[model samples]
Structure formats: structure tokens, C-alpha cells
Target: MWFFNKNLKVLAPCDGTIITLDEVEDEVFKERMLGDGFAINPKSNDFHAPVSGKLVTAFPTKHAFGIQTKSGVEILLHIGLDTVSLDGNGFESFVTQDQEVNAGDKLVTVDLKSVAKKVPSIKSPIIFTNNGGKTLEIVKMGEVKQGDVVAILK
Candidate 1:
């Protein structure tokens, strides 16, 4: 424990405006049923890995997925509400499942033009799926470029 940093640095998954989970439109997220974290209104197309971890779950649909750090911190990055309805039409994945990735590595690139038009909202959620009793601290607000450290789990 003395040697451990005991910190989880959460970066912005893409160029976007950060919003709390309360502002998420989906009831599941709004109520924090899945976990406590934040959302982002992406201004860019490509979504990057917010933490250095293994690509735990990359859905075939590509609308959402997950990552797990070595310490067991889990993150679920859901691209859009019901965007799975797109059925992988606008998603282009860069990493395969179980691949090790550093923070800011491109996870997927979305054709937002067509996908946004079809989906209700592209306000994505970057959730800390398992905090393991650690407190998540949101460090910055408003706009952020991909890879900016926006929050910390301590």
C-alpha cells in the first residue's frame, strides 16, 4: 500500500463537454443504477480510451463497451442512447477485445453525422462501473479535449 499511488485518473474519452450523470437523459444512468460517473456531449467523432487498461468488452454493435484497469477499476463507455439500433452502421473500432491500451488510444470512430441523426441524443456516458469504495472526484468542468484528466478516483 505504501508504494501504490491509490489513484485512478479518468480522462475525457473524446473532445466534449462534461456533464454529471444526473443530466444523462436515460433513466438507468440518471438514477445511477449502473454506477456513479459522468457524461459527455462529444464534439469530435473518435472516442479514445480514458484509462490505461485492457479492452474488456467491445460490443459487436459498437455503441458501447468497457475497459478494466490492472487494479480492477471498471469503466463502461456508452456511446449513445439506443444507438445500438444503428447496428454497427456508423462505428469503426480501432482496438480488439482484450487488447491492452493506453489512455487516449483511439477506441472507436463514429460517423456522427448519420448516427446522430438517427439516435435521440449522442450524449455519451463514461461510467466508473466499479469504484471498489473509492471516491470519484470530478476535477474539471465544461469542455475538454480527448485525454485531458477530468476526474480522479481516490
Candidate 2:
């Protein structure tokens, strides 16, 4: 199963709200890079609706976002870690909860270069938080351009 589109640029994998995006230690994203604490000064902002569905949850300080799709597929689009201290300095959301969005919509804008410079943006995963099981197929590896066809679902 492939979920991402080719040259997708900012496409939603499913028709769901932007699940959660809270700022944690990002240990999940940094499990491999030990002894390197990635610091992200993420400012307060809104989490855009990745897909048109329902806002399951929205947290304070723009720390998290959650959305459930019409098809019952839930996805999480967590930005940077340790970014809560940025105070809205580097990123911005363009959509809202329950708002309808199509493929290739502008979800948010990140200082990707800054993120790359500060943390391991190259390996900052856009993981499918749902239990896709046998339905998920991972495509490519090691330094892929954003919006590339990374996966698909049957």
C-alpha cells in the first residue's frame, strides 16, 4: 500500500484532521543520534488540518494537533521537537481543524533549512502514526526530497 504521492509537495495521506504536534524531547525522532540533543525553538501557532475531517484534539501552546478522517484514518503531523521555546519564530500553520483540504495544499511552512541546521531534519520522519499493519509500504530511504512518493496504500 502506498500513501504518499509522487512529487506531492504537501499532500495529506488521509482525510483526517492534523492529530497531535506537541513538543517533546523528540527522542522518537532522535533514537539513533545519541549524545546529540536537538534544540528547536518552536513558537506558538495553530496546527493546520492535514485532511478534512474532525478535530479530535487541539492542545495549548500549539504543542499538539489531532484529527480523525472521514474514513476513520487518524494521522499525526508533529513538527519539531524542543521547538516550544521558539515562540512562533520559525513556523506557521495555514489550515484549521475540520477545514476541508485537498491533496497538495499548503499545510505549514517551516524554516526547513533552519530545522536542518539545528536538528536532524534530514531524518525527521513523517511517520504514519496509525497502525497501518500490512497496508503500509515504505518507499525510499536516506535523504529523500520532501513531497516525494514515499509510500502508498492499497
Candidate 3:
């Protein structure tokens, strides 16, 4: 018998310094309670689609978005700590829910400086929400560009 596995590439949604989940300030992300992945201290406010997939969830507040890859990998891009409390003040979404997006396509533009003032920190977590039940690996880490391959889902 033979088996084939499809690997989904996870890209960096922005240019930033990648940090371990342990470094996240928020307990929810820091503890890896939301799921395993990594965080980034973004150098800019621009956010891009990390994978080519359907936008499953783009929160009304624009603070977070979820994508479901064609292979069924689910990812959540949560921007900043407690940013939801901002009530969409410093965030803007370029895509609507259920829309399809390609990797590196601009997804959201954030007013990082403004949102940073309202939140405790600007540590964004790119979590693999489905990794807990699937095979996901952090293949890359540290500083990365917007389209850099940061992880792999098998």
C-alpha cells in the first residue's frame, strides 16, 4: 500500500521578527491555548494572506481573520493583544468573509501605532487552529518577509 500526503505552505503575513509562542504577552496566545504556531513583532501595519484559501472568518472588528486552505488546514491570524477591545478602531479589512485569497495578497491594513496605544502590545499570532488535531510543523522562524514560508502543514 502507498499513501500520499499534501503539504500546505504557511507564509508570513507581514514583515516582522518572529517569536516563540512563549514570548507572546497575552496568556491566551502565550500559553498556546488557542493553538500552536508563532508570533511576530511586526515592523509594519500591512497584513497579507498567508495562504491561498477561502477566508473563513474575517472578524467585524478587523482584529482577526481565519483561513481554510484547500487541504482543510485552518489558520487564524490574530492581530495584537486585546485588539478586539479597540472595536475596529485601528484596523481595516480588504477582503470579505468567504472570499478567496492568494498568498501575499493584502488582507488588512492596520494602524499599528494607533492600535498599539490602545492595546498592551502589538504581538500578532499566526496560529494553526487545526494543528492540535493534525500534523503541523513550524519549519521556519525569526525575521521573515510578507510571503516567506513560515510553516508546513502535512
Candidate 4:
């Protein structure tokens, strides 16, 4: 006998490897201060929205962002480690006013070298700030194609 909880799918924000929150470079996020979620390497330099939702936490620097799905899950996306120091120097955001985004929609594009090695700032985290009692389980690891469902959102 076996049991599987009812859940949703969490899509990859960009094409790259999947890194869990606990293993992320930021201890602040690892501590789940902003809530639990996962991080991914911005392998394509193009980050996209993983779900249809409202962008609630858009930083002026484009270093960090957040999405609130219709289900009330706040998905936070941080562009890099300590990249906030860039002060919007090395990044570009595609998100417009109203801040509504669909899954796979272009969110931001990055100029990696522009980051100037501030921890490389390319490994970004996708956090679920308000999971609404839902949990996460990584079903796939290693190299992941964007749009692939990497987490079973419980």
C-alpha cells in the first residue's frame, strides 16, 4: 500500500539545476525567514514566472522578486547572493505594471558578468513565502529544463 498527498506542481523558473532552500547560499533564506522554497541556477540568464500570479515583491534593483499565485502562494525569486549591492546595475526586468504574470512568462534577463562576482549572483531562489499549508517535495534534481515541474507542491 502507498499514499500520495494531493498537491500541485512547481515549475522551474529557468533552465538549470535544482537547489533546495536548505542548501542555498543564503543562510537567511535557508532559515526560512521569508518562508520555504527552492533555488535554481540561472543557467539561461532568462528567468521566468513559474506560475500565473501577481508579482507582489518587485525590488527596484531587480535583484529580488516575488509572485503571488491565485492560490495565495508567495513565490519569492532572489537573483543572486549579495547582488543587492548592484542596486539594479546588472539586470533587466520584463515585468510591467499591474504585475500579473503567467507561467513561463519572461520575468527578467541578467547580464552575469555585470554582477562583478558578487557571489556570481546567478544562483537565484524561488521561495514560497505563503504556502497556505502546502508543502514541497523535489521530484527531480540536477539539470532541469525550464517549464519542467520539479517540485510536487503539497
Leading candidate by TM-score: 1
Name the regions of candidate 2 deviating beyond 4 angstroms.
Answer: 1-25, 29-67, 113-123, 132-134, 142-146
lDDT of 1: 0.87
- For all predicted structures, in order, the TM-scores are 0.93, 0.51, 0.91, 0.87
Q: Can you write out model 3's per-residue Cα lDDT over 2-118, one digit (the tens) per residue?
A: 267557778888899888889988788889886888888888889998888899988789988898887677899989889889888878889899999999899999999898889
lDDT of 4 by residue, 1-154 (tens): 3366456677887888987777776678778886777788767888888877898888778877788877787777788788778888868999864598888888888887667376644677877778875667555778999899887776
Task: Quantify all predictions' global Cα lDDT against the true fold.
Answer: 0.87, 0.40, 0.84, 0.77
Q: Which residue pairs collide in model 1, if any? A: none
lDDT of 4 at 51: 78
Tell me how far the alpha carbon of residue 143 in candidate 1 is from the true structure, in angstroms, after superposition.
1.1
Residue 60 miss distance in model 2 (angstroms): 6.3
Clashes of each: 0, 23, 0, 0
**lDDT value, candidate 3, whole model:** 0.84
The positional error of residue 64 in candidate 3, measured at the CA in angstroms, is 0.2
Instruction: Compare candidates 1 and 3 on lDDT and give the better one.
Output: 1
Q: Candidate 2's residue-wise lDDT over 63-101, tens digit each?
A: 334455555555455555554555544565665665555
